[PDB]
Ligand binder design. Structure first.
Ligand SMILES: *[C@@H](C)[C@H]1/C(=C/c2[nH]c(/C=C3N=C(/C=C4\NC(=O)C(CC)=C4C)C(C)=C\3CCC(=O)O)c(CCC(=O)O)c2C)NC(=O)[C@@H]1C
Ligand SMILES: *[C@H](C)[C@H]1/C(=C/c2[nH]c(/C=C3N=C(/C=C4\NC(=O)C(CC)=C4C)C(C)=C\3CCC(=O)O)c(CCC(=O)O)c2C)NC(=O)[C@@H]1C
Ligand SMILES: *[C@H](C)[C@H]1/C(=C/c2[nH]c(/C=C3N=C(/C=C4\NC(=O)C(CC)=C4C)C(C)=C\3CCC(=O)O)c(CCC(=O)O)c2C)NC(=O)[C@@H]1C
Ligand SMILES: *[C@H](C)[C@H]1/C(=C/c2[nH]c(/C=C3N=C(/C=C4\NC(=O)C(CC)=C4C)C(C)=C\3CCC(=O)O)c(CCC(=O)O)c2C)NC(=O)[C@@H]1C
Ligand SMILES: *[C@H](C)[C@H]1/C(=C/c2[nH]c(/C=C3N=C(/C=C4\NC(=O)C(CC)=C4C)C(C)=C\3CCC(=O)O)c(CCC(=O)O)c2C)NC(=O)[C@@H]1C
Ligand SMILES: *[C@H](C)[C@H]1/C(=C/c2[nH]c(/C=C3N=C(/C=C4\NC(=O)C(CC)=C4C)C(C)=C\3CCC(=O)O)c(CCC(=O)O)c2C)NC(=O)[C@@H]1C
Ligand SMILES: *[C@H](C)[C@H]1/C(=C/c2[nH]c(/C=C3N=C(/C=C4\NC(=O)C(CC)=C4C)C(C)=C\3CCC(=O)O)c(CCC(=O)O)c2C)NC(=O)[C@@H]1C
Ligand SMILES: CC1=C(/C=C/C(C)=C/C=C/C(C)=C/C=C/C=C(C)/C=C/C=C(C)/C=C/C2=C(C)C(=O)CCC2(C)C)C(C)(C)CCC1=O
Lengths: 178, 67, 5, 161, 160, 160, 160, 161, 160, 161, 160, 160
C-alpha cells in the first residue's frame, strides 16, 4: 500500500515520462507487459494522441479498456461475473462494492456489451474522484464498504490466470425481498 | 466516430492539492460522441466550466455513416 | 379475428 | 449550485456583513413560497414524461423537424431530443425547488449552446419545445407555480438563445 | 456496408484487412446484382406490400385501430402506414449495404425511447415487420427469401 | 442548504425528488422562521458575543496575547476579534441555511494551511470558537441554543 | 422506510444521522398512528378499490381488454386485478413504511423489462394506478388523500 | 465513417426516399470498382512495411531532414515519422477499400495540420515523403490502382498542406 | 476459425450473430470443400515446398549462412527449415479453418520476442514465407493459389 | 526541460558535432556557478514557507485582496494563494538550480495566464506577490544568488503579465 | 544532466530537491573536471575507437558486411561507422551531462523501431557498442574507463 | 531506505535500476559509516536525551504535568518519557536508513488522530521533539547535529 508509485502525467513535454506512464497503464489494465500477447502494438495511435496531449490519461485508460485485446484477455474466457470482478480490479482498483453494483454492471454487459461496461466504469464519479483525469489507475486498499477489502485482497493476491474460480460471485442477501 | 474536442476548466472545491494541477484543471481533451453526454454531466457536476466544445471529428447532421 | 385467451 | 438561502448568504458575504432586514425578508419570501414549490415539484415528478410527450407533440411532431432531413429525424435523434427535454424539465424543477437560477447556469447552460452549434441543433426549435414545456407544466401546476416555472424555462431558453 | 464494418474492425485491431474480410467484401461486390434487384423489387412493390402487411397487422391486432388505440383515427393509421414505409425503406437500404448498420442507426438505436414517448406498442410493430417479412417472401424469389428474411429477422429481434 | 443537498442527491441518481425528500423540504421551510429568529438573536449581540469570547479566550490562553505571541499587540488583537466576528457570521449563515455547507465553503476548507501560514495556533482559535459557543448559548433560548450548537460544534470539530 | 433512507444517506457520508434526520424520524414516529390508520383504510376497501379501479380503467382504455389487447378474457382481466392488488399492497407498504424505497424494492425495479416481456402497455398500468389514486382519494379524507396520493403518485411516475 | 454505399444511403436518407436511378448507377459503379479495390488493398497490405521502407529511402533518407538539425534526427522522432507514414498508408488503403474519403478526414487529418505546425514538422518534407509513398504504391499495384491510391494520398497531402 | 471469431465479436457486444457474420459463415461452410482441397494440395507437397522455398531464400539472402551469420551451421540451416515447416503447418491450419485465428494462436503472437531472443532477423523469415507463397502458388491451381496466398500474405505482412 | 549542461549539449547536437572549446567554457562556467546555485537552493528549501509568509504579509495581507469581495477571501482561496506561491518559489528554485528558465515555460507558465483568467485570479496582485517573494529571497540568500532567483521570478511574472 | 533528473524526481514527489540529491549535485559539479577530461579523451580519439570497434564487430559479425547482410556496399559500412560515431558522441554528451537522459532522449527511445525499418540487426549494433566500450576502456585510465562503461553498458542494455 | 525506494520505482516501471539510482546507492552506502556513527551517538545517550528533553518540556509546558493535565501522575510522566523514547528510537531508525521513511511509517501516520483520541496536545509533543533536537545538537558535532536535525525537524513539522 505504501511501496508503490502513482503515475501522474504532469506534463507531456517529457517524452520519457509519457512512455513510462503508458507502460504503467498497460501493466495496470492488462496486469502484464503486452510484449508476448500481441503481434505488434495496436495502441500506437492512442500513444501518439496522449503524447500530443490531445487526450487525457483517463481517455487512454478507456481506450485500453475498449480494446480487442482486453476482451480477448479478460472478457472472452470468463463469465460476466468474472468479467465484472476483473474489470473493477483493473480500472477502479477494487472489487465490486455490493450486489447493486454487480446488478448494474451485469445489466450493461447484457444490454450493451463490454465497451459500455468499460465506459461506465471509467467515466463514473468514483473513477474521477479517485484517479482524476491524469493518474493511471492503481491498486487500492479500501476500508469500506463491508467485504470490499477482503475481496480486493483476494483479487490482487493471485497472479494472472491463477484460477478460474469467482472471488466475489455475489453477496448473499441477509434479507430477501418478497 | 464523430469525436468532440472540449476545452474545460475544472477547479478544486474541496482539497488543496500540493502538486501541479494544470494538466487536469484546464485541459483540452478528446471525447467520443457516445461518451460526451456522460463526460459533460460529470464535468458540470464537478463544478467545472465548459470553456469550449466542438465537433472536431465528424460531420453535423449525418443521417447515415456515423461510425 | 380473435385472440387466444 | 445555489438556492435562495445560499444566494442570499453569498450576497451578504461578498461584502462581508451579517444578514440585514432585506436578506431576512427575502428568506421569509422563499420560505413562504416553499410550500407551493414543493407541491408543484410533486406534480411535475408525477407527470414529467407526459409533459415532455404533449410538449413535443404540440411543438415538434408532424413538423419540419421530425421529417426526414430534419434534426429530430431518425429514432436516434428522436431519443436524443426526448432525453434533452426530459433533462430540461428535471433541471427546471430543480431550479424551482432551489428558487435560484445558478443550477441552470452551471449545470444546464455551460457547454450546451456551443454543443448544439457544433451538432447543428436548431436553437429556434428547442426554444419552442421548451416553451411547450412551459405551457404544459403551467396547465398542470397551476398559474401560481406556472409563472415561476415559466421564468426558469425562459431562463433556459435565453441562455440557449 | 460490410466494407465499413471490416475497416472499423481492422482499425480497432490496428491491422490491415485479413483474408476473411477480403473474401467477405469480394463476395459482397460480386453479388451486388442480387441485392440491387431486391432493392428495386421492394421499391417498386413497396406500396402494395406495406398496405397488405398493415392489413394483416390489423387482423392480428385490431385493438391498435380500436377507438382509443394509438392507430385509431385515419390520421393515426396513415401514420402507421408511413412508419411501415419508413421501416421498409430502411430494410431496402440495408439490403444494398450488406450489413445492418443503417438499420441500427436510423431506426433501431433509440427506437424504444421514441415508441415509449409516442406510446406505440413496439411488439405490435414487431408483428407488423413480421407481416412485411411474409409479404416480401411471397412477392419475392425463393433463394432471395433467405437474404431478405435475415434482415427482417434482425430487425424483428432487435426491435421486439 | 438542505434544498441544495436534496437536489444534488437526486441529480446524482438522475431522478426527481422523492416524496420523503419533499416532506424534508416541507419541514425545513416550516422551521425557517425559528432559524431566522436564531439568526436575529446571534446577529443582534454579535459585538457583545465577540468581546466576551475574546476576553475569555485571552484569559484562558494568555500566550497568544503575551509578548512574542501571534495576537500580541492592539492591532493583532483587533485582527483576531475580526476573525471571531467572521466565524460568528459564518455560524449565522449556517443557522439560516439549515446546514454546514456555507460555513465549510467559506471558512472551513484549507483553514489549517491558512493558519499554519499565518503562524496562528489552530487549537487556540478552536477554543475561541468554543467560547463564542457558550456565550451565544447564554444569550439564547434552550432550543435555539441547541440548534446553533450543532453548527458551532461542527466548526470546532472540523478546525480542531 | 424513512428510517432506512436516513440510515443509508448517513452511511453514504459515513456520519451519524443529522438533527434534521433525527427530528424527521421523530415526527414520523409520532404521527405514525395516522399513517397506520390510512393503511388500514386502504386495506379495508381493497376488494372494492380494485373493483371500481379496474372498471374505470377498462372504460378508459378498453384496448387492453379489446381484441388484440393483453387481457382479453375474464382470465387475463383477473390477472390484471391480481397485479392491481399487488400495487395496492405496494402503496399500503409505502404508506406504513413512510418511504418509497420498499416499493422500489418490490414493484418498480426492472418493471419496464417485465411489461415489455409481457407486452403489457405500461402506460395503461400507470392509468390504472391513477384510477387507484382518484377513487381512493374519493373514499378518504383530503389530507389523508394527499398522504396516500404521495405514494400513488410516485408509483404513477415510476410507471411512465 | 462512411463508404460510397453508406454515402449514397445517407444522401438518399436526407430526402428520406428510396434509391433512385442516380444512386442506382452509383452503387453499380462502386460494386464494379470493388473487384480491383480488393486486390489493390490485398497487395498493399502484402508489403505495407516495404513501401514505407523504400519510399523513405528515396524521399527522406540521407537528406538534411534525417541529419542532425533536421526534423528526423534522433531515433525517437525518426520512429514517429515512420509510424506516421505507416498511418498514412494504412488509412489511405482504408479509404480505397471504402471508396470514400470520410475515414481519411475523420481519423488521420483530425488536427494533423495544427499538430505538425506546432511541433515544427516540415510540411514540404512530409508532402515529398507522401509523394514517394504514392509513386512506390503506384509502381507496385499498377497504374489504375495506383491512381485511386494516389488520389487519397494527395488528399492527405492537401490536408497537411 | 471464422465461427469462433464471429462468436467472439458477437459476444463482445453481447448479441446474436449479425446478418453479415451469418452470411460469411454461409459462404465459408459452402466453400469448405474447396478450402479442404487446398488443404490436401498444401499438405501433400510439404517437403518440396519447404525445399524450394528455403533453397531459393538461401541465395536471396546469403547473410543467413554467411560467416558469423544467424545460420552458418548446417544444423542452423535445418533449424530454419524446421521453422519453415512450422509456419507452413500453421498457414495450412488457417486455410482449412478459414480464419487467421489459428496462426495467431499458434505461431505468430510473440514472434518478435521469439526472434529477438534468438536473434534471428524477422525480415529474412518473412522473405522465407514469401518464397513459400511463391512456390505454393506455382505448384497449385490459380484460384487455389490465390486462396492460399491470402493466408501466406497475411502471415508474411503481419509478422513482418 | 533543459539546463545549462543540457542547453550546451542540445546546441552541440543540433549541429551534430562533439563538444568543443566554447562548450567546455560554458560547462566550466556552469560548474563554477553550481556552488552558489546549490547553496542558494538549499537555503531557500530550508525556509520556503517562511519566505512565502513574509512575501504574502508585506504584499497582500490587510488589503482589498484579503478582505471580503477579493479573490483571496475565504480560507479556501487563501490556501490556494499559499499553494500558488509555494509553486512559484519551488519552480523558481528549480530553474535557478538548473540554470535555465525552461521549467517555468513547460511546467508553470503553460496555461497559467488563461487559467487565472478563467478562474478570475487577479494577475497584478499575483505579480506583486512575486515581486515580494523576489525581494524576500534576495534579502535571505544574498546578492548574487538573490539576483539569480530574481531573474527567474521576473521571468515568471513577465510570463504572467 | 543530473540536475535535470533530480529536479524531475523532486517535481514527481513535489519536493525541494532534498539534501540527499543536493550533495550528489555538489559532488558532480565539483568533480566535473574529471568528467570533462574524459570528454576530451573520448572526443579527440573518436576516429580511432570507431575504427577498431567496427573492425572487431566485423570479425565477430562478418555476415552484416557480407553482400546478403545490411552493411555490405562499402557505403553501408560507412553508415555503420557513422552510427557508431553518433553513439560515441551521445556517450560523450551523457558523460559531460552526468546522467543518461540525453542518451535516451537522443538515440535510445524507439531505437528498435528505428532499426526495424532499416533491417539492421539491432543486436549487432549492441555488439558494436560493446566493442566501442572495450576499446575506450582499453584506451583510458581505469576508473575513467568504469565511469564511461556505465553509460556504455547502459547503451547496450537499452539496445538489447 | 533509498535502496527500497529505488527498487520500488524500478519495479513500478518494470525495469532494472538506472545508473543514477545505482550511484545514488553508491553514495548512500559510502555515507552509511557516518550515518551509523550518528545513530550510535544518539543511541548511547538515549536516557540522557529523554531526561533533559522531558525536563525542558515540562519547564516550558508545566500545565501538562500539573494536576488535571494529561501527564500529571508519575505514571503519566513516565508515559510521556516512553513516547519520547519511541520518537528518539524512530529518529535513530531514520538516521540509520538515511531517510524519513521509517519515522513516518512507524510513528507519524495518524499520530494526530491518536493523540486526539488520548487528549494529548500535539503542540506539546512537537515542543518535546524540539527539546530533543536541542539536546542532541548540544551533545553532538555540528555537521552531525544538522544531519540529525533534518529528521528532528521533519518529525516536528509532521506534528505541527
Ligand atoms: C486570536 C485569539 C487568534 C489569532 C488571530 C489572528 N488572525 C490574524 C490574521 C488573519 N486572520 C485571517 C483569517 C480569515 N480571513 C477571512 O476572510 C476568513 C474566512 C472567512 C478567515 C478565517 C486572515 C486572512 C488574516 C491575515 C490578515 C488579514 O486580515 O488580511 C492575526 C494576525 C496575523 C499577523 O501576523 O498579522 C491574528 C493574531 N491568532 C492567534 O494566535 C489566536 C489563536
Ligand atoms: C494568490 C496570492 C492570488 C490568487 C490565486 C488563486 N489561485 C487559485 C487557483 C488555482 N491556481 C492554480 C495554479 C497552478 N496550479 C499548478 O499546479 C501550478 C503550476 C505548477 C499553478 C501555477 C490552479 C491550477 C488553480 C485551480 C485549481 C486548484 O485550486 O488547485 C485560486 C482559487 C480559485 C477558486 O476559488 O477556484 C486563487 C485564489 N488569487 C488572488 O486573488 C491572488 C492575487
Ligand atoms: C402502427 C402499426 C403503429 C403506430 C404508429 C405510429 N407512429 C406515430 C408517430 C411517429 N412515428 C414516428 C417514427 C419514425 N420516425 C423516423 O424518423 C423513424 C425512422 C425513419 C421512425 C420509425 C415518428 C417520429 C412519429 C412522430 C410523428 C412525426 O413523425 O412527426 C403515431 C402517432 C402517435 C401520436 O400520438 O400521434 C402512430 C400511431 N402506433 C401503433 O399503435 C402501431 C403499433
Ligand atoms: C430536442 C428538444 C432538440 C434536439 C435534441 C438533440 N440533442 C442531441 C444530442 C445531445 N444533446 C445533449 C444534451 C445535453 N448534455 C448536457 O450535459 C445537458 C444537460 C442536461 C444536455 C441537455 C448532448 C450532450 C448531446 C450529444 C451526446 C448524445 O447525443 O448522446 C441530438 C443528436 C444530434 C446528432 O445526433 O447529431 C438531438 C437531435 N434536436 C432538436 O431538433 C430539438 C430542438
Ligand atoms: C552498423 C554496425 C549496423 C547497421 C546500421 C545501419 N544504419 C543505417 C542507416 C541509418 N541509420 C540511421 C539512424 C541513426 N543513426 C544514429 O547514429 C542514430 C542516432 C540516434 C540514428 C537514429 C540513419 C539516419 C541512417 C541513414 C539515413 C540517413 O538519412 O542518414 C544503415 C544503412 C541502411 C540502408 O539500407 O541504407 C545501416 C547498415 N546495420 C547493420 O547490419 C549493422 C549491425
Ligand atoms: C514523417 C513523414 C515526418 C515527421 C514525423 C513526426 N511526427 C511526430 C509527431 C507526431 N505525429 C503525430 C501524428 C499522428 N498521430 C496519430 O495518432 C495519427 C492519426 C492516427 C497521426 C497522423 C502526432 C500526434 C505526433 C505527436 C505525438 C508523438 O510524438 O507521437 C514527430 C515527432 C515530433 C517531436 O518533436 O516529438 C515527427 C518527427 N517528421 C519529419 O520530419 C517528416 C516529414
Ligand atoms: C528460418 C526461416 C529463419 C531462422 C530460423 C531459426 N530458428 C531457430 C530457433 C527456433 N525457432 C523457433 C521458433 C518457433 N518454434 C515454434 O514452435 C514456433 C511456432 C509454434 C516458432 C515460431 C524456436 C522455438 C527455436 C528454438 C527452439 C527450437 O529450435 O526448437 C534458429 C536457431 C537459433 C539459435 O542460434 O539457436 C534459427 C536459425 N534463421 C534465419 O536466419 C531465418 C530467417
Ligand atoms: C375514442 C377516443 C377518444 C375520443 C373521444 C371522443 C369522440 C370525445 C368526444 C366527445 C364529444 C363529441 C363531446 C361533445 C361535447 C359537446 C358539448 C359539451 C357541447 C354542449 C353544448 C351546449 C351545452 C350548447 C348549448 C346551446 C346554448 C347554450 C345556446 O346558447 C343555444 C344553442 C346551443 C345548442 C349552442 C379520446 C380522444 C378520448 C382518446 C382516443 C380515442 O380513440
Amino acid at each position: 500500500r505504501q511501496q508503490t508509485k502513482v503515475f501522474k502525467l504532469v506534463s507531456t513535454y517529457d517524452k520519457v515520462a509519457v512512455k513510462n506512464a503508458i507502460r504503467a497503464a498497460y501493466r495496470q489494465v492488462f496486469e502484464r507487459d503486452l510484449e508476448p500477447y500481441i503481434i505488434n502494438s495496436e495502441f500506437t495511435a492512442l500513444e501518439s494522441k496522449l503524447s500530443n496531449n490531445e487526450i487525457n490519461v483517463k481517455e487512454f485508460i478507456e481506450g485500453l479498456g475498449t480494446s480487442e485485446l482486453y476482451m480477448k484477455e479478460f472478457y472472452a474466457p470468463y463469465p460476466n461475473t468474472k468479467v465484472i470482478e476483473m474489470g473493477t480490479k483493473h480500472f477502479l482498483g477494487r472489487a465490486p462494492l455490493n450486489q447493486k453494483e454487480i446488478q448494474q454492471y451485469n445489466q450493461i454487459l447484457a444490454s450493451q456489451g463490454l465497451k459500455a461496461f468499460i465506459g461506465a466504469m471509467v467515466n463514473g464519479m468514483e473513477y474521477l474522484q479517485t484517479f482524476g483525469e491524469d493518474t493511471v489507475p492503481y491498486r487500492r486498499f479500501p476500508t469500506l464498504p463491508a467485504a470490499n477489502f477482503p475481496n480486493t485482497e483476494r483479487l490482487y493476491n493471485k497472479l494472472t490466470k491463477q484460477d478460474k474460480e469467482l472471488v466475489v460471485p455475489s453477496f448473499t442477501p441477509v434479507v430477501k425481498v418478497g | 466516430m464523430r469525436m468532440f474536442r472540449i476545452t474545460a476548466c475544472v477547479p478544486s472545491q474541496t482539497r488543496i492539492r500540493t502538486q501541479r494541477e494544470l494538466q487536469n484543471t484546464y485541459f483540452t481533451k478528446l471525447v467520443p460522441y457516445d461518451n460526451w453526454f456522460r463526460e459533460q454531466q460529470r464535468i458540470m457536476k464537478m463544478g467545472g466550466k465548459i470553456v469550449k466544445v466542438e465537433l472536431a471529428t465528424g460531420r453535423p447532421g449525418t443521417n447515415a455513416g456515423l461510425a | 379475428w380473435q385472440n387466444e385467451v | 449550485m445555489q438556492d435562495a438561502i445560499t444566494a442570499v448568504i453569498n450576497s451578504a458575504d461578498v461584502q462581508g456583513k451579517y444578514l440585514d432586514g432585506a436578506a431576512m425578508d427575502k428568506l421569509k419570501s422563499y420560505f413562504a413560497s416553499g410550500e407551493l414549490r414543493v407541491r408543484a415539484a410533486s406534480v411535475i415528478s408525477a407527470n414529467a414524461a407526459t409533459i415532455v410527450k404533449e410538449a413535443v407533440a404540440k411543438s415538434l411532431l408532424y413538423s419540419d423537424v421530425t421529417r426526414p432531413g430534419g434534426n429530430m429525424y431518425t429514432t436516434r435523434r428522436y431519443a436524443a431530443c426526448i432525453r434533452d427535454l426530459d433533462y430540461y424539465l428535471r433541471y427546471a424543477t430543480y431550479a424551482m425547488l432551489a428558487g435560484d437560477a445558478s443550477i441552470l447556469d452551471e449545470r444546464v447552460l455551460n457547454g450546451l449552446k456551443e454543443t448544439y452549434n457544433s451538432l447543428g441543433v436548431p436553437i429556434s426549435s428547442t426554444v419552442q419545445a421548451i416553451q411547450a414545456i412551459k405551457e404544459v407544466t403551467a396547465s398542470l401546476v397551476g398559474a401560481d407555480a406556472g409563472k415561476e416555472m415559466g421564468v426558469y424555462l425562459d431562463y433556459i431558453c435565453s441562455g440557449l438563445s | 456496408s460490410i466494407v465499413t464494418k471490416s475497416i472499423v474492425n481492422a482499425d480497432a485491431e490496428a491491422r490491415y484487412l485479413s483474408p476473411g474480410e477480403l473474401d467477405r467484401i469480394k463476395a459482397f461486390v460480386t453479388g451486388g446484382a442480387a441485392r440491387l434487384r431486391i432493392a428495386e423489387t421492394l421499391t417498386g412493390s413497396r406500396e402494395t406490400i406495406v398496405k397488405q402487411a398493415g392489413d394483416r397487422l390489423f387482423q392480428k391486432r385490431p385493438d391498435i385501430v380500436s377507438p382509443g388505440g394509438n392507430a385509431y383515427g385515419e390520421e393515426m393509421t396513415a401514420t402507421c402506414l408511413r412508419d411501415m414505409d419508413y421501416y421498409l425503406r430502411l430494410v431496402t437500404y440495408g439490403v444494398v449495404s450488406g450489413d445492418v448498420t443503417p438499420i441500427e442507426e436510423i431506426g433501431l438505436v433509440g427506437v424504444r425511447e421514441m415508441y415509449r414517448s409516442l406510446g406505440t406498442p413496439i411488439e405490435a410493430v414487431a408483428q407488423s415487420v413480421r407481416e412485411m417479412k411474409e409479404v416480401a417472401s411471397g412477392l419475392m424469389s425463393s433463394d432471395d427469401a433467405a437474404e431478405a428474411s435475415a434482415y427482417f429477422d434482425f430487425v424483428i429481434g432487435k426491435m421486439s
